[PDB]
Design an enzyme around this catalytic site. Structure first.
Site: not given
Lengths: 386, 147, 490
Positions: C1-2
């Site tokens: 996930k960013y």
DNA sequence: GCATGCTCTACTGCTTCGATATCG
DNA sequence: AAGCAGTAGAGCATGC
């Protein structure tokens, strides 16, 4: 070979793409698991762990379809929550929508084979999710409370009967049916044959008496017929002749007095057994209050004249003193004044030669704002004589 | 039955935990939007428009208060897009409560930052000035400053 | 996930013995733990300032939580690092800080059990963001909290099994009761000492992974390959200088306009044109024409044949070199061709030439694409990316010229003496560690007004050489190395 | 056979953060 | 550039 067939099935279940396919996959997976659960020979312990590894691989990278699929699987298979109970209790908070309903419908089928249940749900602010106006959540939470009650301690049961008896303003006859079933449990099982073990174990008996009487003006028939068939039973109100009248005062509760006269003659006439004339009386009673007033005020004097043989002189003083006390209690505890009731008590008290000394400080205060003054004047004058 | 949730919404905001006030305000404003549009008896509709419109307490002062925040966005948005259904449950009988709504929406536009809520202020002004046409009731609003 | 984040619960032991001075007079492990906590917060306030942090003391007399169990008291909720929360955590130093802890809670009870892991789990089960790492750094000393009853230990390891069911990773910092590996007790079916790293190797950094561009390369006109163009020398500097209104501690948010044709009023940007002036004649344009004349190509990369790796001299560069890599998001299955082309470029040493237009509207620049292959061993030593590197080439007016009219000879005697000097001054260059002087003194100078300890800590310079440590490494050959073949003598 | 009750997923748009050309 | 939500042209079931 059997070891590729179901693998293709569950790998298709891993195709997380369409509302039809994985839902139907989980459904028929539950069905085949149930039939091999009854058919305990072989081939369970492969595909159980196959869908379990698929779910474990599913869980960390995706959660929405995980809880939807677990709900769909446990919709027809109980024991596949035992590998995920800390998982479902973990990510029960901070979901909303239909998904919280999915979590609670999962946990309904495993509140029997559990130990030490209440601490987690009390940590999950359960008194916030019994106070949201969706209907399926509020039905299923009462349905788990009907299972997680009979393992609890009264010091939290009194915490539990504080927000669940705010449901006497509720639609949906099954929701109030559950609500008047759990209280019907709790009053049946906390009858305390001289236990007196607590203040809380005598507090919830009172606040469970308060609703199992107040639910006799329900805006629905039939649901009233349930409670009436419960009340016309043994060990609620005895059934010789007089004991029903002698106990019938204590379920007063001035939330109901509007109906109380019709209810009194209803319970009084229920234990009945040149026949066709008594049942139209109970037909006419509960719409015209005046003939209800006259019927009660005549049954009363009939009983209290025909009891000179039975229950003799040393008992009469006890019964009259209790009834004097109880009429005092009626007139002191009513808040909504009802004229064809106030006149009923002051028209049966002004006949028997033991109840004339009723309550001179409260009778006038009733009949001055009840606007039934010419029976209070008559009562005080007949007590001022002899 | 209302004004209970009104004072609850008014008093629940002053302390900390500025997500709890948001969720409670969402629930209670949903309650007001459920329990005020349903009624139809016209004197009781006048009772409701005299209940929610008070110079000390009410929705206008509640949305006047906590604008110096960022957590009261969802509830304020629900209020400002609920008032364009409340200006269409009723009509030109709201005209002696108009200039306060105009100043409310004008400060809410020229004071806020996010256009998740800046556009519905212009929605209420563009509904209101479309309704109340060119009459005596256009001399309250200083058009010479608005332009 | 960013945009996902990482939580951290710091669990501190205080029942009987960690508050003890170990019958020593150097330092207590309790204040050592508070040193470590305050250093990791003073690091992650500027290094990674969006992680989620929490600190929980267990075992004491009082208890304040959300579940109301004994001997469990928290001070911070899972949140960003707050300078006020560290200005209230710094007061627990010294004898008076120990006294302050003692008169706000004291310590000592029949302390916790599985229930402190329970309150860690219910601390994790509440915050609605995305989680990637979930670590518990426990600060405790003893190796049997179940020193009298076995049901405590059985339910503790079952609770640790249920916490590893969802996988919450705990790994303590054992204190130095023997100073190392002697007390190897049965604290091993729970988890799967070194503290100077946490004390000072985290001074000022940043962490991010984006992509900066997602373009396509065209070989002829019909070979489209989807690439992402990452940057790996970010060239960082300080956060921006906000303006502030004086007294009430508020921002300003200023405006701007243009008007005044000596009449007053207000002019809109619609009536605005651009111009250039030579002496008397002015060439007038519209802004659409000004942005129109910098249009030469589409956004993308264009192949222009190949080259061998012999002519592009390392004297030539003008840009921080980027990095490119194929992704299977736009065009399906292009990493197959990229892996084949990578294999033949590393087998035949060849490197491509291309024309570059990165954004949707830009003049072109010629780039060269150079192959590159990974290095690895058993410790997951991933140090070089497998892919292509982009060296940037000048065009016309960049390479200027010197006056060129100088050439003198020399004589081969000084080569061995200079070999002696360079072998005195020999070192392997680096692997890291040449930290920034201006930024380090700036962040310590900000820290000085942040926590108000006493003053600016003078951040030690590192770019300067140790002049005495090369004087004595050299010796007394300096004067002969001056005047062996070139005496100045005025 | 025209005007309503009822679902529906692709498109577009705003926010957040980071990177690069620009006049001074 | 990632991501985050919510509108809305576009169809189905239904009434007069």
């Amino acid at each position: 070979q059997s070891s590729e067939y179901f693998q293709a099935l569950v790998n298709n279940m891993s195709f997380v793409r369409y509302k039809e396919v994985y839902a139907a996959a989980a459904e028929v997976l539950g069905l085949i698991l149930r039939y091999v659960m009854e058919r305990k020979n072989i081939l369970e312990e492969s595909l159980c762990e196959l869908v379990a590894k698929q779910l474990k691989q599913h869980q960390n990278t995706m959660e929405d379809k995980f809880i939807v699929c677990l709900n769909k699987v446990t919709k027809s298979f109980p024991p596949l929550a035992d590998r995920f109970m800390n998982a479902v209790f973990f990510l029960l908070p901070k979901f909303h929508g239909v998904l919280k309903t999915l979590c609670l419908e999962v946990v309904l089928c495993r509140v029997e084979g559990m130990t030490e249940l209440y601490f987690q749900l009390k940590s999950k602010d359960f008194v916030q999710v019994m106070r949201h106006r969706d209907d399926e959540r509020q039905k299923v939470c009462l349905d788990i409370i009907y299972k997680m009650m009979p393992k609890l301690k009264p010091v939290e049961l009194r915490e539990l009967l504080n927000p669940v008896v705010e449901f006497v303003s509720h639609p949906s006859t099954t929701c109030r049916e559950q609500m008047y079933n759990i209280l019907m449990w709790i009053h049946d099982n906390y009858r305390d044959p001289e236990s007196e073990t607590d203040n809380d174990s005598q507090e919830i008996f009172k606040l469970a008496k308060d609703v199992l009487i107040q639910g006799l003006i329900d805006e629905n028939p039939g649901l009233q017929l349930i409670i009436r068939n419960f009340w016309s039973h043994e060990t609620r109100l005895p059934s010789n002749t007089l004991d029903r009248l002698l106990a019938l005062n204590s379920l007063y509760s001035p939330k109901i007095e509007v109906h109380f006269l019709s209810l009194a003659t209803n319970f009084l006439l229920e234990m009945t057994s040149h026949s066709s004339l008594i049942t139209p009386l109970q037909a006419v009673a509960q719409r015209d209050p005046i003939i209800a007033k006259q019927l009660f005020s005549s049954l009363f004097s009939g009983i209290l004249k025909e009891m000179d043989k039975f229950k003799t002189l040393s008992e009469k003083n006890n019964i009259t003193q209790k009834l004097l006390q109880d009429f005092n209690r009626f007139l002191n505890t009513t808040f909504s004044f009802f004229p064809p009731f106030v006149s009923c008590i002051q028209d049966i008290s002004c006949q028997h030669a033991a109840l004339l000394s009723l309550d001179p400080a409260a009778v006038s205060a009733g009949c001055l704002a009840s606007l039934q003054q010419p029976v209070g004047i008559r009562l005080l004058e007949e007590a001022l004589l002899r | 039955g209302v004004r209970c949730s009104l004072l609850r919404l008014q008093e629940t905001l002053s302390a900390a935990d500025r997500c709890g006030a948001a969720l409670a305000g969402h629930q209670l404003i949903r309650g007001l939007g459920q329990e005020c549009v349903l009624s139809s008896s016209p004197a009781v509709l006048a009772l409701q428009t005299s209940l929610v419109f008070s110079r000390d307490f009410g929705l206008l002062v509640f949305v006047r208060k906590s604008l110096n925040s960022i957590e009261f966005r969802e509830c304020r948005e629900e209020i400002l897009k609920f008032l364009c259904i409340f200006l269409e449950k009723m009509g030109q009988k709201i005209a002696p409560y108009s200039v306060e709504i105009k100043n409310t929406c004008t400060s809410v536009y020229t004071k806020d930052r996010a256009a998740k809520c800046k556009i519905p202020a212009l929605d209420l002004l563009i509904k209101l000035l479309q309704t109340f046409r060119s009459s005596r009731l256009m001399d309250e609003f200083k058009i010479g400053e608005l332009f | 996930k960013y945009s996902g984040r990482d939580s951290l619960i710091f669990l501190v032991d205080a029942s009987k013995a960690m508050f003890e001075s170990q019958s020593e007079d150097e330092l207590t492990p309790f204040d050592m733990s508070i040193q470590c906590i305050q250093s990791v917060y003073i690091s992650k306030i500027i290094s990674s300032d969006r992680d989620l942090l929490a600190v929980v003391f267990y075992g004491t007399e009082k208890d304040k939580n959300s579940v109301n169990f004994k001997n469990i008291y928290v001070l911070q909720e899972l949140d960003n690092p707050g300078a006020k929360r560290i200005l209230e955590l710094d007061q627990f130093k010294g004898q008076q800080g120990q006294k302050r802890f003692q008169d706000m809670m004291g310590h000592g009870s029949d302390y916790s059990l599985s229930e402190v892991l329970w309150v860690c789990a219910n601390l994790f089960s509440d915050v609605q963001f995305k989680m990637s790492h979930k670590r518990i750094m426990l600060f405790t000393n003893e190796d049997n909290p179940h020193g009298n009853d076995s049901a405590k230990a059985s339910r503790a390891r079952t609770k640790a099994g249920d916490l590893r069911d969802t996988g919450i990773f705990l790994d303590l910092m054992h204190l130095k009761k023997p100073g190392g590996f002697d007390i190897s007790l049965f604290y091993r079916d729970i988890i799967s000492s070194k503290l100077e790293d946490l004390l000072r190797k985290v001074r000022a950094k940043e962490t991010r992974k984006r992509a900066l561009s997602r373009l396509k390369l065209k070989l002829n006109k019909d070979i489209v390959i989807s690439v992402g163009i990452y940057n790996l020398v970010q060239k960082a500097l300080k956060p921006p200088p906000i303006k502030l209104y004086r007294e009430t501690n508020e921002p300003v948010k200023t405006k701007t306009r243009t008007f005044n044709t000596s009449t007053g009023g207000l002019l809109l940007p619609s009536d605005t044109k651009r111009s250039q002036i030579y002496g008397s004649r002015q060439i007038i344009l519209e802004k659409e024409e000004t942005e129109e004349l910098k249009r030469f190509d589409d956004p993308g990369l264009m192949l222009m044949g190949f080259k061998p790796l012999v002519l592009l001299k390392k004297h030539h560069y003008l840009r921080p070199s980027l990095f490119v890599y194929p992704e299977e998001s736009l065009v399906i299955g292009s990493s197959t061709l990229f892996s084949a082309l990578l294999i033949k470029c590393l087998e035949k040493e060849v490197a491509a030439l291309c024309r570059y237009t990165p954004r949707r509207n830009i003049p072109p620049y010629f780039v060269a694409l150079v192959p590159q292959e990974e290095e690895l061993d058993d410790q997951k030593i991933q140090v070089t990316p497998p892919g292509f590197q982009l060296v940037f080439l000048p065009f016309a007016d960049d390479k200027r010229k010197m006056p060129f009219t100088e050439k003198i000879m020399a004589t081969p005697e000084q080569v061995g003496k200079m070999k002696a000097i360079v072998e005195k001054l020999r070192f392997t260059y680096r692997s890291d560690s040449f930290e920034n002087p201006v930024l380090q003194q700036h962040f310590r100078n900000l820290e000085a007004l942040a926590l108000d300890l006493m003053e600016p800590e003078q951040a030690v310079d590192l770019t300067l050489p140790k002049v005495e440590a090369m004087n004595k490494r050299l010796g007394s050959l300096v004067d002969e190395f001056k005047e062996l073949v070139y005496p100045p003598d005025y």
